[PDB]
């Protein structure tokens, strides 16, 4: 099954519908990153830190981030493409 996820960036809103929160941060972030322009390699989605790390890329969403239907906030800056 697929778990949707809402992302917030600069007042913008973008939901996901390709993978599940139990997939991986880099998996979801990469998706919204194309709609927001900002990648996870620069910033991280508002959530929690595991093993002392700011939710690595291999770190699942529902792991520390939050629920699927729940929306997350993007803290950081976009990359220069």
- The strand pairing partners of 55, in sequence order, are none
Give the DSSP letter string of the chain.
----EEEEETTEEEEE-SS-TTT-HHHHHHHHHHHHS--TTT-EESS--BTTBS--TTS-HHHHS--SSSEEEEES-----
Can you tell me the distance from the alpha carbon of 22 to that of 78, in angstroms, rounded to the nearest whole number? 25
Fold of 1-81: Ubiquitin-like (UB roll) (3.10.20)
């Amino acid at each position: 099954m697929a778990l949707p996820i809402i992302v917030k960036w600069g007042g913008q809103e973008y939901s996901v519908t390709t993978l599940s929160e139990d997939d991986t941060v880099l998996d979801l972030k990469q998706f919204l990153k194309t709609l927001t322009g900002v990648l996870p390699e620069r910033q991280k989605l508002l959530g929690l830190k595991v093993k002392g790390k700011p939710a690595e890329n291999d770190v699942k969403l529902g792991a520390l981030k939050l629920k699927p239907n729940t929306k997350i906030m993007m803290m950081g800056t976009r990359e220069e493409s």
